[PDB]
């Protein structure tokens, strides 16, 4: 819910401010059990493709071999 959405954009919006802070956020989030699928819900805009390098990174961080 809204709770929720907000934290996981805050988050989002730390390693956009921050590139080094990916690593912490998306242990944190693996530990949480989100999805590649469901992070999506977390990063709606107006501006297309605003939160892509969150969405790229934790894609390699849970599926890069
Ligand atoms: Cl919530
Ligand atoms: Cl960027």
């Known amino acids: ?3 929720e959405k907000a934290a996981v954009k805050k988050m989002a919006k730390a390693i956009m ?3 080094s802070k990916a690593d912490d956020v ?3 989030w693996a ?7 469901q992070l ?3 990063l709606k805009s107006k ?3 605003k939160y892509d390098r969150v969405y790229n990174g934790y894609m390699t961080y849970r599926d890069y071999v």
Do not use: E, H
């Open 1 to 3: 819910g809204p709770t």
């Open 17 to 19: 401010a921050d590139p």
């Open 26 to 28: 998306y242990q944190k």
């Open 31 to 37: 530990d949480k059990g989100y999805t590649l699928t």
């Open 40 to 42: 999506s819900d977390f």
């Open 47 to 49: 501006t297309r493709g």
